[PDB]
A paper describes a structure:
Two enzymes, peptidylglycine α-hydroxylating monooxygenase ([name]; EC 1.14.17.3) and peptidyl-α-hydroxyglycine α-amidating lyase (PAL; EC 4.3.2.5) working sequentially are the only proteins known to catalyze this reaction. The two copper atoms in [name], [name], and [name] (located in the N- and C-subdomains, respectively), each use a single reducing equivalent from ascorbate to catalyze the reduction of molecular oxygen for the hydroxylation of the Cα of glycine at the carboxy-terminus of the peptide substrate.
Even though the molecule does not contain copper in the [name] site, copper at the [name] site has the same coordination and geometry as the wild-type. The [name] site displays only the minimum changes compatible with the mutation and the absence of its copper (RMSD 0.61 Å). The N- and C-subdomains come closer by a small displacement (<0.5 Å). More surprising, although it has no copper in the [name] site, the conformation of the two remaining histidines in this site, His 107 and His 108, is almost unmodified from that of wild-type [name] and the [name] site retains the same coordination of the copper observed in wild-type [name].
Numbering used by the authors: 46 to 48, 51 to 306, 311 to 355
Write the structure that this text describes.
């Protein structure tokens, strides 16, 4: 359980990093705790594997981000305060009773160097815990496999977030549409995660190419928000449009909710050939709203 060393070298090029809560005593149900772990190398390195070290009963949710400024410098903190004060580049999400996302063979996230993130920030959410267990420190976390051997495919995140959108009170279905033109080298989408708050019914993401929608994925965002795998990975390519839709319900809500708060985020996890690769992309617009008249019917079907 509690108390390998922080850094464990493996061959010339490889090392393991144990990212572990420093003996925390979670009081209270659904409390999100955070710790940072600086990268031991200044040079470019590649995260090529992950291994959860989650306590069985206590832990329901773990996230790992890549970023440059962690919100606290303390040995741990509460992620209510924040994760990183800058852009938090998400790398790994784990839920209990969830298919954990596993990097395809030659894929790694690019960290360190001038570009890449310097810190990992770990986020561990605990269940109901409860009972008469205050005499218990927890060291939950995850081990990361890093190497300085350059990888031929580089993983990254395409984040789609809604910003315009107002949820009127009482309307049973409200749609939040997001769309950008893709204008880079090809990316290959292998997983997705969806974030909303209370009112999300379902989030869906698509590549649209010559007016044909291909599914990237869809999920009820009230399920655990891990990275779900893509059945067959989707190449997204120059002149494709990425388009997302969230269905909210303002049933019972007392007044207008904006995006008292709500979010629609789609995390699209991809790989790109190392030379043309980018670690991060974003859409926060709906350039092609007219298009959504076309959207497959399956995108408005609830996932209860
Ligand atoms: Cu949120």
């Amino acid at each position: 359980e509690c108390l390998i060393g922080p850094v464990t070298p493996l061959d010339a090029s490889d090392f393991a990093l144990d990212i572990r809560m420093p003996g925390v005593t979670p009081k209270e149900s659904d409390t999100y705790f955070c710790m940072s772990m600086r990268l031991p190398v200044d040079e470019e390195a590649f995260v090529i594997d992950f291994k959860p070290r989650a306590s069985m009963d206590t832990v329901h949710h773990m996230l790992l981000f890549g970023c440059n400024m962690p919100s606290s410098t303390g040995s741990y903190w509460f992620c209510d305060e924040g994760t990183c004060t800058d852009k938090a580049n998400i790398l790994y999400a784990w839920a209990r009773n969830a298919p954990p996302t596993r990097l395809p063979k030659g894929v790694g996230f690019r960290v360190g160097g001038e570009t890449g993130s310097k810190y990992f920030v770990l986020q561990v959410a605990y269940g109901d815990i409860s009972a008469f267990r205050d005499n218990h420190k927890d060291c939950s976390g995850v081990s990361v496999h890093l190497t300085r051997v350059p990888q031929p495919l580089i993983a990254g995140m395409y984040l789609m977030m809604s910003v315009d959108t107002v949820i009127p009170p009482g309307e049973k279905v409200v749609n939040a549409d997001i769309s950008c033109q893709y204008k880079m080298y090809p990316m290959h989408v292998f997983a997705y995660r969806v974030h909303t708050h209370h009112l999300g019914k379902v989030v869906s993401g698509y590549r649209v190419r010559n007016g044909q929608w291909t599914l990237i994925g869809r999920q009820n965002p009230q399920l655990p928000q891990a990275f779900y795998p893509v059945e067959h990975p989707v190449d997204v390519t120059f002149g494709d449009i990425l388009a997302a839709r969230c269905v909210f319900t303002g049933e019972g809500r007392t007044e207008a909710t904006h995006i008292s708060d709500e979010m629609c985020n789609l995390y699209i996890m991809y790989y790109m050939e190392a030379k043309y690769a980018l670690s991060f992309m974003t859409c926060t617009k709906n350039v092609a709203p007219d298009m959504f008249r076309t959207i497959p019917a399956e995108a408005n079907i609830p996932i209860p």
